[PDB]
Design a protein around this ligand. Structure first.
Ligand SMILES: [Zn+2]
Lengths: 137, 52, 143, 172, 191
RNA sequence: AGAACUGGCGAUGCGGGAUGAACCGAACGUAGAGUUAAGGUGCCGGAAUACACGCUCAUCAGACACCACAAAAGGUGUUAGUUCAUCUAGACAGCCGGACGGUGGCCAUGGAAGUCGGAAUCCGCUAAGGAGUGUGUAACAACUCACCGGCCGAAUGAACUA
RNA sequence: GCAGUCAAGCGUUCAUAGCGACAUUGCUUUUUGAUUCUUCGAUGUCGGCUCUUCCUAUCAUACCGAAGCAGAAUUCGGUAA
């Protein structure tokens, strides 16, 4: 090296346009966006698309996601909805592992007894062709 | 012996101090409070006494 | 007291902006307390020089943007360490008493004001050559 | 003293044949329920005017719902409170989305910082500071800056189960 | 009151390199390299360019914010030591018994030896620290001079010498003897 | 030690206060099922290592009524607050420029020009510059400072309350 | 019995180096009072001798800070049983 190498933590910022995942409550599970910062432990959020009511909420019951998108600070519900659509948030969200795994673990949870059986017979069938591969190179 | 300027050097260290009048702690000459936990960080200081 | 004195500065400032119709905005960056004391004597004829704090002058000038309002486009020039020289004498005479005289190793003119106008003091430094040839290259343009 | 509601409380002296139509007096009252709101009303009327509920009545009780409940506003709050050794006036500011919310953290804050319980506190005035830079306390101007953003370092997810087969990370 | 954000700036001058990982700092310059472990403070470094690095403390209160500034100076002092470098000058002070001062060593230790302090038949030894070099002024009587890249290590070695000569059981206003710091600065850009 | 009204203990188990005549809760046939009181819910120990906003770091922290004590007096620890004053006519702080003329002011003397020292503190020109804050000279010089301005851009000083 | 706060005063000069009046806050339970709760079908009643152990409000001994510490001597204080 001959540069000054300084690796700074790349934190999710609480900021207007930060999209967040609601951990707790009656809108738990859903995404919303940060509209306005109230104080160091509180924010105003809005999730028109995902069906979550514009409210003040503790940053405790929400997890910041890596998603941000252009949003004027204070935007009423209506325009939030327009900017969220414009930015294709849900699109980007669904493309993440974070989204996929939640969906996977919900699919697993939905399985019938019978379906688990099949998963067993299929997973078993797969193992066979794998250990063969495993014993070649 | 000892030139006036070296006699000043030794005085910056030995002679130019204040003293806590509660616990005798030897403090910087312009200190407002004492640094010691034991006398309750008092602001009752006094200058270290000069020689003849 | 502190308000009293500042208000006085607003007074004598206005006093020059009405009487004197022409203004020299100079810049005395560095410059001794002695030099300025001598520019006074060397201008005791007509011009008077008036120094002040920039924050005062803009506020004062803006405060007088009612009557005598064309001192608005004077404000972009009252930055840095500038001063004022008001006068009722011919242009190019005073300017060269200021600049060249009492120079050291003086003070520089940064802009000039004349009846609502803003001279760079460069256009003032005319040689009557660019004004004669323009009256010469146009007569031949008509012949 | 709970989850607060604001009340319009209005009463009057009982009519006398000498004074039918005595004047109506109103208060804005933060309390948990109407039964406290009414009682706080008389508490003050006793002290301000010279009246006892035994001779006056309660004309109307109405809840003042916050006008713009999802719009963040800066609140100026004025308070009179008693201490272990004196009684004092105070100005404070609170940033929130409703008066009712503002009052709640005021009542909490008085208790944490000054050990002042509900009984020991009069609320004098609560007023949404209209023009920013009429805000006068640093801990709120701090949040008034433009394009304002901050991280939340050292994040501690709560574990659902007692044992964990991986060392946790605080990485947010 | 807890401060939403507060920061400091470190000018990285022409010729030095500063690299930071896990709050461990390495500063490399024409005089050499210095390392420092700042794990004991929660600060997050961020680089703007090879000339400037910003230190910050998000959401911190008074005593936390106070450490921020001292991190700057800490790192600052490293940078200058590795370019300008540091030098502490001292002076021998005695009224009768001339303090005789030499360098001796065992197993390649290097000590500062001090004899005849106030007539003392005893012999004091200050271990010389790794990275500080002891010279003796040639144009100034009874001086002695300690130079290195680290103020920390140089100033401390200077104090160790000065502290070994502390005069016991006498009025120390009258018995002014000792070795005291006479000047402190650099080894570059004048003296 | 001695009275007043009431409630207790004595004569009374039970739940709580670790413990305990008198406190809190509640008074008692033999049992089942539910719900509670006072008090509790990290583990001992039945019951949220619950939710929420702050405060606190104690090389003698603190932790619950009766109750198993603490004071006059102090702190530039940290938190919130009050008051007077300064400041968008630009302060505070930081960096930078200027810091002048009568005049080496009068005495005093080897020599003393702002700065060993006596008495005076005046004027000019000022945006400002003391008949002088220091450093330095034999005495001048040179440098510094009060004072003013350049840049910056919203807070700053002092005394207090708990 | 022991320790504080205030500072008039002492200390050639100087309140606080060392002290400290008038007043005033406390601590202790080796004094002595006060009380009468336990023991009057009995807890051997003083001092010394002997031996162990504890308290620290420290006399000595270790290392310090302070002085009206020049040295020698002393005094004030800290960590210290
Ligand atoms: Zn002390």
């Amino acid at each position: 090296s001959t540069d000054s190498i300084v690796k700074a933590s790349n934190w999710r910022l609480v900021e207007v346009g930060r999209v967040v995942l609601i951990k707790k409550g009656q809108s738990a599970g859903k995404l919303a966006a940060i509209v306005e910062i109230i104080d160091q432990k509180k924010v105003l959020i809005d999730g028109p698309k995902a069906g979550v009511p514009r409210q003040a909420i503790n940053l405790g019951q929400v997890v910041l996601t890596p998603l941000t998108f252009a949003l004027p600070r204070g935007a009423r519900t209506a325009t939030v909805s327009k900017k969220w659509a414009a930015a294709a948030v849900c699109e980007k969200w669904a493309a993440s592992s974070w989204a996929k795994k939640i969906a996977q673990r919900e699919r697993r949870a939905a399985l019938t007894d019978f379906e688990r059986f099949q998963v067993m017979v299929l997973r078993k069938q797969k193992r066979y062709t794998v250990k063969k591969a495993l014993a070649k190179a | 012996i000892i030139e006036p300027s070296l006699k000043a050097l030794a005085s910056k260290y030995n002679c130019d101090k204040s003293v806590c009048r509660k616990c005798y702690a030897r403090l910087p000459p312009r200190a407002t409070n004492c640094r010691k936990r034991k006398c309750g960080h008092t602001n009752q200081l006094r200058p270290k006494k000069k020689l003849k | 007291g502190i308000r009293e004195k500042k208000a006085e500065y607003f007074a004598k400032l206005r006093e020059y902006l009405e009487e004197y119709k022409s203004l020299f905005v100079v810049g005395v960056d560095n410059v001794s307390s002695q030099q300025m004391h001598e520019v006074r004597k060397e201008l005791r004829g007509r011009a008077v020089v008036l120094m002040g704090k920039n924050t005062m002058v803009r506020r004062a000038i803006r405060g007088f943007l009612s009557d005598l309002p064309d001192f608005e486009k004077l404000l972009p020039f009252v930055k840095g360490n500038v001063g004022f020289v008001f006068t009722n004498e011919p242009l190019t005479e005073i300017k060269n008493v200021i600049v060249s005289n009492r120079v050291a190793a003086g003070l520089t003119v940064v802009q000039v004001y004349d009846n609502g106008q803003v001279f760079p003091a460069a256009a003032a430094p005319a040689a009557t050559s660019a004004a004669s040839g323009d009256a010469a290259p146009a007569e031949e343009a008509a012949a | 003293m709970a989850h607060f509601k604001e009340y319009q409380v209005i009463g009057r002296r009982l009519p006398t044949e000498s004074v039918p139509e005595p004047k109506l007096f109103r208060m804005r009252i933060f309390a948990s329920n109407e039964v406290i709101a009414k009682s706080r009303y008389w508490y003050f009327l006793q002290k301000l005017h010279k009246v006892k509920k035994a001779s006056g009545e309660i004309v109307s009780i109405n809840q003042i719902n916050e006008a713009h409940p999802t719009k963040v506003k800066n609140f100026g709050v004025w308070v009179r409170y008693d201490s272990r050794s004196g009684t004092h006036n105070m100005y404070k500011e609170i940033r929130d989305v409703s008066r009712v919310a503002a009052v709640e953290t005021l009542y909490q804050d008085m208790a944490a910082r000054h050990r002042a319980r509900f009984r020991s506190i009069h609320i004098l005035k609560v007023a949404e500071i209209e023009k920013t830079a009429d805000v006068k306390r640093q801990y709120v101007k701090q949040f008034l800056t433009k394009d304002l953003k901050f991280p939340l370092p050292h994040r501690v997810q709560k574990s659902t189960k007692t044992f964990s087969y991986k060392r946790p990370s605080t990485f947010y | 009151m807890k401060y939403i954000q507060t920061e400091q700036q470190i000018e990285v001058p022409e010729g030095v390199t500063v690299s930071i990982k896990s709050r461990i700092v390495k500063v490399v310059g024409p005089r050499g390299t210095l390392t420092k472990n700042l794990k004991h403070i929660d600060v997050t470094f961020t680089k703007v360019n090879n000339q400037l690095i910003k230190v910050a403390v998000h959401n911190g209160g008074r005593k936390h914010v106070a450490a921020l500034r001292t991190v700057k100076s800490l790192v600052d002092n490293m940078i200058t030591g590795v370019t300008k470098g540091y030098k502490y000058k001292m002076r021998y002070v005695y009224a009768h018994f001339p303090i005789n001062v030499n360098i001796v060593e065992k197993d390649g230790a290097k000590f500062i030896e001090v004899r005849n302090f106030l007539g003392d038949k005893k012999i004091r030894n200050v271990p010389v620290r790794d990275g500080v070099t002891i010279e003796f002024s040639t144009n100034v009587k009874d001086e002695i001079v300690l130079s290195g890249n680290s103020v920390e290590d140089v100033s401390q070695n200077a104090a160790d010498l000065q502290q070994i000569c502390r005069v016991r059981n006498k009025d120390i206003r009258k018995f002014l003897d000792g070795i005291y710091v006479s000047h402190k600065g650099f080894i570059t850009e004048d003296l």
